[PDB]
Amino acid sequence: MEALVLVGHGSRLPYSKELLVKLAEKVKERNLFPIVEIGLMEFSEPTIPQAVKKAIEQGAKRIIVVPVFLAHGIHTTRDIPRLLGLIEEIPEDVEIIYREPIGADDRIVDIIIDRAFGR
Amino acid sequence: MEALVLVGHGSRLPYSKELLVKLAEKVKERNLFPIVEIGLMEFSEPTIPQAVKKAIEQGAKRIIVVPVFLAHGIHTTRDIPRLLGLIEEIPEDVEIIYREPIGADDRIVDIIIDRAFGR
Ligand SMILES: C[C@@]1(CC(=O)O)c2cc3[nH]c(cc4nc(cc5[nH]c(cc(n2)[C@H]1CCC(=O)O)[C@@](C)(CC(=O)O)[C@@H]5CCC(=O)O)C(CC(=O)O)=C4CCC(=O)O)c(CCC(=O)O)c3CC(=O)O
Ligand code: NI
Ligand code: NI
């Protein structure tokens, strides 16, 4: 009934998509959502609209899109809302819920500190 | 003796730099490092080389550079190591230690899950 779509930038290198994929795997491991899908903005497949369609086709009425990005930018404020047609398609009776990026979360400062220490 | 330099992409929007800055503030608040500096790759000041010089000028011999990026890409594997002259202005008796990005860390999946729930 609800689907989680993780959305990433995309890269010409593969690392970015690997990251999204490992992220999806890990949230799958927590058994919280019925459907869990990924989409990249540029370069790679699946694309965002592809992932959104794939989610609807599995019978989701409420689509939770999380931008896996540290900050807001043009990607998160123009391109992506556009691609989900929240600015400029999708069954009338389906709502896309566009969430917030990671931001300056305490857990990020934990992660950064670990990274400083080669841990 | 050791300095932490947080390094970010930069955007034409301000959000990115705000993020770096809030991150620096938070790690400053944890009193773990003598010196804590930020640099953006493009669009904004301070720049990476500026932040590195600012760190040396405060008497740091070991400079810990953490790329605040989710994944590896061109920025983290070419441009930044280049800018720190690790592949091709640094006193010979100073070492730059180039750390790892955030990656698919469990704490990120925690954060993502929170974001799905509008928390
Ligand atoms: C290689 C390249 C390929 C390409 O994307 O074209 C690339 C790659 C990546 N960017 C990433 C991150 C961001 N990129 C932006 C913004 C811009 N990045 C741009 C270009 C390029 N970015 C190409 C370099 C061409 C060159 O320098 O030679 C601009 C100029 C053009 C544009 O993107 O349209 C645009 C400036 C604003 C504008 O467009 O006006 C923002 C901020 C924002 O969005 O405002 C973030 C924050 C991300 C975050 O916060 O997480 C990540 C993952 C970052 C991560 O993992 O954290 C990758 C992956 C990788 O580097 O391989
Ligand atoms: Ni981009
Ligand atoms: Ni870039």
Q: Distance between CA B74 and CA B102 in Å, rounded?
A: 15
Domain that holds residue A38: 1-119
Give Cβ neighbours of residue A97 (< 8 Å, ≥ 6 apart). A62, A63, A64, A65
Work out the minimum CA distance from A16 to partner chain B, whole angstroms.
5
Work out the minimum CA distance from B89 to partner chain A, whole angstroms.
23
Q: Distance between CA A104 and CA A16 in Å, rounded?
A: 20
B85 is in an annotated binding site: no
Two structure tokens written together for B24: 């620096």
Contacting residues of A for B23, CB less than 8 Å apart: 104, 108-109, 112
Q: What is the whole-number distance in angstroms between the Cα of residue B32 and the centre of ligand 1?
A: 31
Q: Distance between CA B64 and CA A53 in Å, rounded?
A: 44
Return the closest-CA partner of residue A115 out of B6, B49, B45, B22.
B6
Sheet with A62-67: list strands edge to edge.
A35-40, A2-8, A62-67, A95-98
Q: Are A43 and A10 in contact (CB under 8 A)?
A: yes
Residue identifier of the C-alpha nearest atom 45 of ligand 1: A73
Cβ of A28 under 8 Å from any chain B Cβ? Answer: no
Q: Distance between CA A82 and CA A41 in Å, rounded?
A: 11
Two structure tokens written together for B107: 């704490």
Two structure tokens written together for B29: 């608040």
- The per-residue DSSP string of A15-33 comes to HHHHHHHHHHHHHHTTT--
CA A101 to chain centroid, in Å, comes to 9
Q: Distance between CA A107 and CA A112 in Å, rounded?
A: 9
Q: Are A107 and B110 in contact (CB under 8 A)?
A: yes
Number of domains in chain A: 1
Cβ of A62 under 8 Å from any chain B Cβ? Answer: no
B43 is catalytic: no
Q: Distance between CA B115 and CA B100 in Å, rounded?
A: 24
B73 lines ligand 1 (CB under 6 A): yes
Burial class (CB in 10 A: 0-12, 13-18, 19+), B100: middle
Type of residue found at B95: E
Residue identifier of the C-alpha nearest atom 27 of ligand 1: B75
Residue A56, SS3?
helix
Q: Are B2 and B60 in contact (CB under 8 A)?
A: yes
